[PDB]
Design a protein around this nucleic acid. Sequence first.
RNA 1: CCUUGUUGCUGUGAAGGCUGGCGAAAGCCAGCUGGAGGCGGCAAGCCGUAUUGAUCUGCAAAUCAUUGGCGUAAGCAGGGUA
RNA 2: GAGCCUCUAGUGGAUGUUUUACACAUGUAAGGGAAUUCGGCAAAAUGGAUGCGUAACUUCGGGAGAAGUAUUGGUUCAAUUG
RNA 3: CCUCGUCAUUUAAAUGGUGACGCGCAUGAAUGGAAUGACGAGAUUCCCACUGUCCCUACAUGUAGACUAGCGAACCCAUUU
RNA 4: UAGAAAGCGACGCGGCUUUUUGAUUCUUCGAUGUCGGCUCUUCCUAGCAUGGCCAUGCAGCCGUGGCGAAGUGUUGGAUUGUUCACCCACUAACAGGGAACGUGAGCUGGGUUUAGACCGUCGUGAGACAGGUUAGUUUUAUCCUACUGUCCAAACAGUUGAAGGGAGUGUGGAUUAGUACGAAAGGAAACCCACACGUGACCUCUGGUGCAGCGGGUGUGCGGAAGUGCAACUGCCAUGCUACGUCUCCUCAAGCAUAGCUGGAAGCCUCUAAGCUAGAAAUGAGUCCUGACUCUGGAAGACGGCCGGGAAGACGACCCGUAGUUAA
Lengths: 65, 383, 141
Amino acid sequence: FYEGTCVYSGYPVPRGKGTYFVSLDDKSSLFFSSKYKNFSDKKIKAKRVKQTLMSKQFCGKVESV
Amino acid sequence: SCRNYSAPRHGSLAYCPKKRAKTTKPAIKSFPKDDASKPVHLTGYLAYKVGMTHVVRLSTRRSKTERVLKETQKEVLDAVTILEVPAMRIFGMVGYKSTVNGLKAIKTVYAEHLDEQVLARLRKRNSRSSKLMFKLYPQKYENGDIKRDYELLKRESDVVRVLAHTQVSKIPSLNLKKAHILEIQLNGGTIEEKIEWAIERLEKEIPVSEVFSQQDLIDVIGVTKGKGKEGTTKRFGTTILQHKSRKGKRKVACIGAWHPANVRRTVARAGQLGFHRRTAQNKKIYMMGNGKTPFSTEYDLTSKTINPMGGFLRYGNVKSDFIMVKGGIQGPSKRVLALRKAFAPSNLGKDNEEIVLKFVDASSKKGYGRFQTTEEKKAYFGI
Amino acid sequence: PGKGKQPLDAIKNRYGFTRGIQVGTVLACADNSGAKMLKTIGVKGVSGRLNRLPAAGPGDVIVASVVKGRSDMRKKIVLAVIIRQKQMIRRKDGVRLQFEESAAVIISNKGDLKGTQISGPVLREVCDIWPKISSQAGSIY
RNA sequence: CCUUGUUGCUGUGAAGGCUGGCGAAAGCCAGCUGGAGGCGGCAAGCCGUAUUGAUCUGCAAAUCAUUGGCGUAAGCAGGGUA
RNA sequence: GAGCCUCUAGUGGAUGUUUUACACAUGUAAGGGAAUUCGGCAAAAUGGAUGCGUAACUUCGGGAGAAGUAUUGGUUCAAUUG
RNA sequence: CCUCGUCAUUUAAAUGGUGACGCGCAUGAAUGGAAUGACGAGAUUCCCACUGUCCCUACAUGUAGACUAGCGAACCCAUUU
RNA sequence: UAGAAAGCGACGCGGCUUUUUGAUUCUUCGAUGUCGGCUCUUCCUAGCAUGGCCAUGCAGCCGUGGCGAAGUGUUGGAUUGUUCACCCACUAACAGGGAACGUGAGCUGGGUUUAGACCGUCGUGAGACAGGUUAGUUUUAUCCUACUGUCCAAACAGUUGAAGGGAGUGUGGAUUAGUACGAAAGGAAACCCACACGUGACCUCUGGUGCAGCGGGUGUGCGGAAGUGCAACUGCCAUGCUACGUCUCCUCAAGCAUAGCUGGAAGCCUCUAAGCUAGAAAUGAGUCCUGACUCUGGAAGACGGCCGGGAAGACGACCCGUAGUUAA
């Protein structure tokens, strides 16, 4: 069982962990931890954070769609 | 003059004086009422605290008067504690007699062969002994002293209890070579039946499945975590004083009036906190199982043991039988606890409901645990 | 129970969430009635203990005064329902939520809404105990 | 009262001066030069507002920390004399 | 001749123990933001230089750094103080 | 003095602040009277920003403190408490 | 609305209290720190809410007068140095008091009440004024006793229970039900579920903290790079600790006020004179914490130090290990 997939990191989230953040734009979004939520606020682009699943796919280190 | 505004007291006087417990192992001091109408059964056991995890269960509990047509079912997430319970071994019995001064012990009778683990409790320092402990007692079997002893117990007794020890050698993480010994009461039938039932079982092993089953309510007796000497702010919960005060803010400001000219026992003072005996009533058994047989739910079709990835932090892996119970339990990992059948049955609706599990969490307790098995980790990373 | 000025006739069950909004808090108004900012002066249902400030969560009814809005409406006392909150909440299923900004919506003594449209997202649990809010909210979470 | 010692860095830009424009005149407007003041921000120093802070069998029969006021001058100081 | 870091030249002892509570010098804090208290006391916030833009009143000197806003590192070039 | 004077404004709420009014217990003209600018570590009220002052406390650092070696006092004292 | 007495009760008369202010001067002038607030505990009842009842000018809803009862509650703010007062908001309700006008080697220092200075009124003046205004140093426990924990009196293993402590309180929703009851308008009465305050524990989750660990930049040192000192800044974060997180909290017996049964005195009557029944958040027990004197058992050796650890800790004490799934 999973809670979902983290918006910023790309990481799958275990049941009973993480949090949803809801913006006034009306969108609901899931984050793995406080670490990656804060990186969003500070406008760090995910592709530069080299341990993320997003970054690894973009570089072609991991096979993706 | 009367004080300006009303407020409640700080802390409960039901637990004063709050002194330190004498030793770490508790005796069950009170047992539920006997009933001659039922078969002979045991009333308690010993267990070791492993650690905590969480589960998801299905529920359908709602007000009987709620007008909603549909049989609504809902997921609930709950925290649980795991206890390890290897089989205890029976090694003797005691009879008691009722007097104007309460119960008094008449005689104690021991098995012919006793184990190294139990003899080790009788000496103080383990590695320095001549081991001439019980070596002359076996003659009493030849002499018929045992047969005279049983006669006296059977003739003159009101209450009968067995002596049992735990097999510490099965739990290596304890670093312990002396067994723990507990006296457990027998309820049901007559004195004669109780004595015969006991005699049949000296030297043998009783599994936990004799005493308890799933969904049962039980009482847990233990000693809490220790916290050393502490001030009034933490020991009794009193408020911190004004920020600009000299001579300290973390204290009770006024400790009495002029008369009486002494301090009352009801005022808060600094001292020992933690390491006290406490009993938790009516906790419910969610599951019973074994540390090395995998299990599954109707919904989670993975097959896994209770052990999380990397084990419980300062314990490792469960190997013997285990019980799982709702909520938190006294003391740190590795402490001994006493389990008892509930003293009286509960009327509350939250207690008497069924339990149906759909998921149990097995992720790592060190750091953020993000996989349920080694197969998932090997699949997420390469190769 | 209905006592004093501005009594409430339509009592409902509380949920036990954390209480992010307390006396002194200024918060936005989400409806189209013409108020813009509300200043919290009291909470319904609070019996109080020494030294503690009264506090509320989603679903609770607050007493407030109108500190920004149209001229006819300012410096008057009004009732409102809390629809979202910036402090974190835990559902009984174990899910946790957090919104970007807190807000409330104005009601009558009988529990009827003052306006006709509500800006932005609203918490699901509120729509379970205040059914009229479901009709005119932006999105439900 | 007599004889001596002690002004480093910066801001603002008075009087006086030179060009260019406007005006019938009188004298108005720009840009630059010049460097006044018990005039501003600071340093070395001199002082003593707050914390009713520390200390109160003190380091000390009046001290210490942070925070403050003035610092191109009815400013601070040694010796001789009344 | 500020604070911070170095060269020349000069420098130091009531012993061991990881050491509860309460202190005295300091750090950080979800949501709320003076509700605290006689009283925002204490703390936080603002901060240098460059440009844009600056009110009432006034003894016409001032107010004025009014207020309010934007920019600032490394590298490689043009141009010569912009 | 009566007095927390009356009316307006500031707050949800004003023994406070500012604006008006005046038979003023007992205002008033170098015993100096009245209206402003620039300047106060002077007294007082409000707004914006800001915050552990507070709701409601939690965790961590240095130095003392506990225990130990060497050195080694005083206030006070009819005392049986 | 009839009517002394549902509720009131003129004109008169008898008491109790010490929480108001007087009256008096017995104790202290080789010194008993003086108003208010903050903090914290206990007691009283003349009962505001919450529980059981009786009367009614008690239809129902809301009330009003009385009885046994002190277990649990009685709040957040604006002006003011205030106790007091007066308003706003919430509430089941926002009752009234005592303990050297409780509480300064517990704090604070706004008021009053030393020495500076302004104003008004009084005085020829020096000066006065329970008139107004502003600035004005809060010392010391290391003694005895109390109180809170700690060891010994009490070898080791298993227990017993004398006596002392004590804990859960309240609100709402749904259903009965738009029912009974009332001309109508209006409008009640268990069980179950949600919550708040209080109590005791716990870290699986989520916040917080950053001592161990990994990274980044500014000024200046070790010829450069690499490894790094000092001034200190900064992003993440194990274990642990913590609340803004999670779990927790009823059952008997004897009986108060009352309302009843049988029943004489007193052939009738009658709750009482003997006897019996129902009876409160109150009382006494159990479940919960502390643990006096005891009781049962094993064996010619036992136990303490020294050495090494922690789940325990101020120091002692407690839990453990020493030729082994021992340590490095």
